[PDB]
């Protein structure tokens, strides 16, 4: 299933976006990509972020990292980018997204946002 | 009537102060009146401990490069 | 005789499966009563 | 972990029939000793447990065997109490039997997709006396031979 | 055991709705102090609210 998904990912205009869960953190045969969006990566693995950045290069391309303010993710992202800045890369900070309210997005109202709390607290892995 | 200090900030810090009120992290319930989703009304005699707590929260998740 | 014995064995296997299904159901309901007791 | 204080109660019960300090008590006095600690065994169960304890025909049991038997009896007693509570929850109408309606209602409440034909097959397989349902004793019997608990 | 564990919590996590206790302070009768000072004490958590009434 993974092989066929990755095989049809590149030569298909209908579908051009996939989600990976820590599987692409090694040397695979992933096809050429221009946009990478990482969310909730590992703690402070500079190796993981460097590998993920390596999956894009082959402004031809650009990759984004999404973090949550006032959380440990801020410190994690700060401490895991020190390798790439030594490599010479600079991380521009984006605080506003143009046309955020231009179109409709998920979680537009507070009802589903507060409904998400029950399902995100439903883990209770004890 | 109530006398004190109005504090205006983002809702995140407002709810952080609300949590500090119920958690008794400062020793009492000095967060008396909540007026707006982004504004609070706190007694002024212990603004310094609130500032210290806010600074600790801010620089905790900062990873200072020094 | 072999066919009758096989049919009886199949019936006993069905009975055992039903017993297993009943045990899980009663355990689940008992757990619900324990966690949601008045 | 079996108990901490009830063990002393079993020691006292054993010493009641061992006032002479011989270390063993008569097998015929097993029925009374159980009643001293709250057990209410039946004649068939008493005979069955006497046969197991006295396979060699000695007629006396030491403290270790008596303690093991008492612990097993306590375990079975709490198990039967839980079984009776489960039956009472199943028999929400207090009819004394787990009928077809009760089983179907419980299955629907649990969210199971069990067919009514399987429900009546279960009821028939749960019928030992031929009354058309399952009673307290048959529920106890199946709980005895359950796959796990 | 795994197949009963994976479903025993599905109904466990279904009924509970309100986790946060209602922190609304139900103050009792106000106590009159000097200089027109009035103090209200919460009956649920003991929160004390002192104010001057005009
Ligand atoms: Ca009934
Ligand atoms: Ca019956």
UniProtKB/Swiss-Prot annotation, chain A:
Subcellular location, record wording: Nucleus
Disulfide bonds: none
Transmembrane region(s): none
Binding residues annotated for ATP, in chain numbering: 55, 58
Post-translational modification: Dephosphorylation reactivates the 5'-excision step. Phosphorylation has no effect on transcription or the 3'-5' helicase activity.
Span of domain Helicase C-terminal: 1-106
Modified residue annotations for Phosphoserine: 90
Description of how the protein assembles with itself and partners: Component of the 7-subunit TFIIH core complex composed of XPB/ERCC3, XPD/ERCC2, GTF2H1, GTF2H2, GTF2H3, GTF2H4 and GTF2H5, which is active in NER. The core complex associates with the 3-subunit CDK-activating kinase (CAK) module composed of CCNH/cyclin H, CDK7 and MNAT1 to form the 10-subunit holoenzyme (holo-TFIIH) active in transcription. Interacts with PUF60. Interacts with ATF7IP. Interacts with KAT2A; leading to KAT2A recruitment to promoters and acetylation of histones. (Microbial infection) Interacts with Epstein-Barr virus EBNA2.
Family classification: Belongs to the helicase family. RAD25/XPB subfamily.
The protein's name: General transcription and DNA repair factor IIH helicase/translocase subunit XPB
Span within the parent record: 588 to 722 of 782
Curated annotation (Swiss-Prot), chain B:
Quaternary structure and partners: Component of the 7-subunit TFIIH core complex composed of XPB/ERCC3, XPD/ERCC2, GTF2H1, GTF2H2, GTF2H3, GTF2H4 and GTF2H5, which is active in NER. The core complex associates with the 3-subunit CDK-activating kinase (CAK) module composed of CCNH/cyclin H, CDK7 and MNAT1 to form the 10-subunit holoenzyme (holo-TFIIH) active in transcription.
Family membership noted in the UniProt record: Belongs to the TFB5 family.
UniProt subcellular location: Nucleus; Cytoplasm
PANTHER family (alphabetical): GENERAL TRANSCRIPTION FACTOR IIH SUBUNIT 5 (PTHR28580:SF1)
Assigned keywords, A-Z: Cytoplasm, Disease variant, DNA damage, DNA repair, Ichthyosis, Nucleus, Phosphoprotein, Transcription, Transcription regulation
Primary subcellular site in the record, as a coarse category: nucleus
PTM-bearing positions, type Phosphothreonine: 66
Protein name: General transcription factor IIH subunit 5
GO process terms (BP): cellular response to gamma radiation; maturation of SSU-rRNA from tricistronic rRNA transcript (SSU-rRNA, 5.8S rRNA, LSU-rRNA); nucleotide-excision repair; nucleotide-excision repair, preincision complex assembly; transcription by RNA polymerase II; transcription elongation by RNA polymerase I; transcription initiation at RNA polymerase II promoter
Gene Ontology CC annotation, any one: transcription factor TFIIH core complex
Cytoplasm keyword on record: yes
Curated annotation (Swiss-Prot), chain D:
Modification Phosphothreonine, positions: 3
GO molecular function: calcium ion binding; G-protein beta/gamma-subunit complex binding; heterotrimeric G-protein binding; microtubule binding
Record domain EF-hand: where: 5-40, 41-76, 78-113, 114-149
Residues engaged in binding Ca(2+) 2: 127, 129, 131, 133, 138
Binding positions (Ca(2+) 1): 18, 20, 22, 24, 29
Note: Binds two moles of calcium per mole of protein.
Name used for this protein in its record: Centrin-2
UniProtKB/Swiss-Prot annotation, chain E:
Compartments (UniProt record): Nucleus
Source organism, top-level taxon: Eukaryota
Organs and tissues of expression: Expressed in various cell lines and in skin fibroblasts.
Outcome recorded upon mutating residue 25 to R: In XP-A; mild form
PTM info: Ubiquitinated by HERC2 leading to degradation by the proteasome.
Function: Involved in DNA nucleotide excision repair (NER). Initiates repair by binding to damaged sites with various affinities, depending on the photoproduct and the transcriptional state of the region. Required for UV-induced CHEK1 phosphorylation and the recruitment of CEP164 to cyclobutane pyrimidine dimmers (CPD), sites of DNA damage after UV irradiation. During NER stimulates the 5'-3' helicase activity of XPD/ERCC2 and the DNA translocase activity of XPB/ERCC3.
Binding partners and assembly: Interacts with GPN1. Interacts with RPA1 and RPA2; the interaction is direct and associates XPA with the RPA complex. Interacts (via N-terminus) with CEP164 upon UV irradiation. Interacts with HERC2. During NER binds XPD/ERCC2 and XPB/ERCC3 of transcription factor IIH (TFIIH), bridging the 2 proteins.
Family: Belongs to the XPA family.
Protein name: DNA repair protein complementing XP-A cells
Gene: XPA
Residues of the full protein shown: 220 to 273 of 273
């Amino acid at each position: 299933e993974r092989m066929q998904i990755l095989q049809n990912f590149k030569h298909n205009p209908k579908i051009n976006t996939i989600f990976i869960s820590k599987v692409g953190d090694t040397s695979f045969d992933l096809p050429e990509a221009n946009v990478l969006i990482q969310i909730s990566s590992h703690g402070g693995s500079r190796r993981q972020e460097a590998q993920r950045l390596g999956r894009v290069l082959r402004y031809n391309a650009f990759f984004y990292s999404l973090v949550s303010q006032d959380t440990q993710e801020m410190a994690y992202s700060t401490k895991r980018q020190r390798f790439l800045v030594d490599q010479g890369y600079s991380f521009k900070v984006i605080t506003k997204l143009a046309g955020m309210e231009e179109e409709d997005l998920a979680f537009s109202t507070k009802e589903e946002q507060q409904q998400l709390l029950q399902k995100v607290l439903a883990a209770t892995d004890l | 009537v109530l006398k004190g200090v109005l504090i205006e900030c983002d809702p995140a810090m407002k709810q952080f102060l609300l949590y500090l009120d119920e958690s008794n992290a400062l020793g009492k319930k000095f967060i008396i009146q909540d007026i707006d989703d982004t504004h609070v009304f706190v007694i002024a005699e212990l603004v310094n401990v609130l500032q210290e707590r806010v600074g600790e929260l801010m620089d905790q998740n900062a990873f200072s490069l020094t | 005789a072999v066919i009758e014995r096989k049919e009886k064995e199949k019936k006993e296997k069905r009975a055992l499966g039903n017993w297993k299904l009943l045990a899980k159901g009663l355990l689940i309901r008992e757990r619900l009563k324990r966690r949601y007791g008045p | 972990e079996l108990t901490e204080e009830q063990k002393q109660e079993i020691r006292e019960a054993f010493d009641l029939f061992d006032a002479d300090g011989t270390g063993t008590i008569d097998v015929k006095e097993l029925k009374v000793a159980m009643r001293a600690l709250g057990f209410e065994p039946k004649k068939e169960e008493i005979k069955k447990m006497i046969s197991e304890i006295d396979k060699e025909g000695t007629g006396k049991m030491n403290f270790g065997d008596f303690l093991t038997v008492m612990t097993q009896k306590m375990s079975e007693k709490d198990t039967k109490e839980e079984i009776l509570k489960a039956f009472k929850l199943f028999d929400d109408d207090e009819t004394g039997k787990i009928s077809f309606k009760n089983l179907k209602r419980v299955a629907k409440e649990l969210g199971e997709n069990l067919t009514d034909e399987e429900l009546q097959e279960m009821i028939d397989e749960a019928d030992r006396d031929g009354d058309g349902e399952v009673s307290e004793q048959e529920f106890l019997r199946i709980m005895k031979k359950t796959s796990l608990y | 055991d795994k197949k009963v564990k994976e479903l025993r919590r599905a109904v466990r996590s279904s009924v509970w709705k309100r986790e946060t206790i209602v922190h609304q302070h139900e103050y009792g009768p106000e106590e009159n102090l000097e200089d027109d000072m009035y103090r209200k004490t919460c009956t649920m958590c003991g929160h004390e609210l002192t104010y001057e009434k005009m």
